[PDB]
Amino acid sequence: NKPNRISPELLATCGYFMPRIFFLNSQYAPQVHWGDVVAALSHFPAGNLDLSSEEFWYEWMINWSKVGDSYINIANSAKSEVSHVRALRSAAACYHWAEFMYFSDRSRKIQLREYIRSCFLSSIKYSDLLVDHQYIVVDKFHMPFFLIFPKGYKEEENHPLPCVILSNGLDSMTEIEILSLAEFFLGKNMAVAIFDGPGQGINLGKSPIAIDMELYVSSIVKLLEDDARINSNLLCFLGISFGGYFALRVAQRIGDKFCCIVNLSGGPEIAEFDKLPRRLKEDFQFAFMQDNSHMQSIFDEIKLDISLPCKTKVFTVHGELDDIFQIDKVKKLDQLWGDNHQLLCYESEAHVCLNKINEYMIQVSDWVSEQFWLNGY
């Protein structure tokens, strides 16, 4: 017999996604172990190596679902709460990687995100963090909302805290990548606000993603203004990916509500829809609940007027080799926005600069703390 291993062909093919799958070493957010990737890919069918093909991502979903199922079995039989929670977190991570680039069964994708959300709410019960979970009603939309306080937080022993609002990207899950980013701010004794806007988190495939997400961010700001535990004069908005695009929108429309805004590899406009690589066409189609023929028009509407003023301090992290948000458009925005925009550009990094995420989140978290200090914290 040969030891369980990932095929050389497969591991190389998946190189772009391995930094995404491992993401950030986290205390609360679900995260895979190397062994989970081996469990998912060790029996992956050979001759199936096309990242743009529906058949690849079907087998990916099936194989990652099996690893998630194995962790639920461990969770169900766990002899302690601490063991139960670790198994649930592992299951949630596996189900996320099963679903994040799978679009061909809407009901199956929604089912997997519901599994993750169920695992998350169960993890909160046994956690040592204060989580305020509620719906924010925006017009007819009931927005899932999580206000999370730092370890050992007591309202009676604290002044009002600074708060970072973090947005999902196109294919992130709120309790996975976003909670992972959020831990950098929780670690610095800041509150964090994470949320499921239309077409985001648990709403992906249920409601179309809203281009004007700043409308939903405004409703979060009003909640934080009313909450005595939060210093509404010390607010940051952070977006990753498409969420970074929302970060640029927030900067233009409601920037004066924020001490600073962080844009993790969002841009003022997306590359031509027709020529998008890998599964990105189906990804954008699924998020917007639209077909191929309607997407370039949406991209045209998405494109920002970079002449419109930036109303706060913006920090952008971007890769020179980003094929979704081209660096030239970000650099054009950087020059135009001038003293109010700082660009950290990684010369040999692809979209989201995920080989640098540990180092840049250290730098980003310290930069946000600095902006709060500059506003008299």
Q: Residue from 75, 230, 270, 352 that binds Na ion (CB under 5 A)?
A: 230
From residue 30 to residue 59, what is the string marking binding to a second copy with x (rule CB under 8 A)? -x-xxxx-xx--------------------
82 binds, among Na ion, a second copy, none (CB under 5 to 8 A by kind): a second copy
Interaction between residue 342 and Na ion (CB under 5 A):
no
Instruction: Pick from 54, 142, 358, 374 the residue near a second copy by CB under 8 A.
Output: 358
- Ranges assigned E (strand) in 11-150: 131-138, 141-148
Q: Which stretch binds Na ion (CB under 5 A): 78-86, 171-179, 208-216, 231-239?
A: 231-239
110 vs 344, which CB is nearer to a second copy? 344
By CB under 8 A, tell whether 340 contacts a second copy: no
DSSP state of 144: E
CA distance 42 to 1: 13
Q: Compare residues 51 and 78 and give the one whose CB is closer to a second copy.
A: 78
Q: Choose among 358, 307, 362: nearest CA to 337.
A: 307
Nearer to Na ion among residue 176 and residue 192 (C-beta): 192
Query: Which of 102, 249, 106, 124 minimizes the C-alpha distance to 179?
Result: 124
Which does residue 230 touch among Na ion, a second copy, none (CB within 5 to 8 A, set by kind)?
A: Na ion
Cα–Cα dist 151/308, whole Å: 40
Binding-site member from 3, 47, 338, 376 for a second copy (CB under 8 A): 3
Which residue lies nearer to a second copy by CB, 87 or 217?
87
As a whole number of angstroms, the distance between CA 96 and CA 176 comes to 8
CB 20 → a second copy: shortest distance, Å?
A: 9
Contact set for a second copy, span 109-138 (CB under 8 A): 128
Q: Kindly report the number of other CB atoms within 10 A of residue 15's CB atom.
A: 9
Segment lying near a second copy (by CB under 8 A), choices 102-110, 229-237, 287-295, 346-354: 346-354
CA distances from 74 to 67, 68, 79, 113, 280 (A): 11, 10, 10, 20, 34
Region for 316 from its dihedrals, namely left if φ exceeds 0, alpha if ψ lies in -120 to 50, beta otherwise: beta
CA distance 299 to 106: 23
Beta bridge partners of 78: none
374 binds a second copy (CB under 8 A): no
Spell out, one character per residue from 75 to 114, where the chain touches a second copy: x when CB under 8 A holds, - when not: ---xxx-xx--xx--x------------------------
Is 366 a binding residue for a second copy by CB under 8 A? The answer is yes
**232 touches Na ion by CB under 5 A:** yes
Query: Please, which residues have CB within 8 angstroms of residue 162's CB and are 6 or more apart in sequence?
Result: 190, 191, 231, 234, 235, 236, 259, 372, 377
Q: Among the candidate windows 50-58, 243-251, 266-274, 316-324, which touches a second copy by CB under 8 A?
A: 316-324
Q: Which is nearer to a second copy, 183 or 196 (CB)?
A: 183
Kind and range of the H or E element at 48? none
Q: How far does Cα 32 stand from its chain's mean position?
A: 16
Q: How far is 129 from 264, CA to CA, in rounded Å?
A: 25
CB nearer to Na ion: pick between 7 and 232: 232
Query: Which residues, other chains included, contact 67 with Cβ-Cβ below 8 Å and sequence gap of 6+?
Result: 36, 39, 40, 94
In the complex, the residues that contact Na ion under the rule CB under 5 A are 227, 230, 232
In the complex, the residues that contact a second copy under the rule CB under 8 A are 1-6, 8-9, 11-12, 15-16, 18-19, 21-22, 24-27, 31, 33-36, 38-39, 70-71, 74, 78-80, 82-83, 86-87, 90, 128, 151, 187-188, 319-321, 347-350, 354-359, 362, 365-366, 369-370
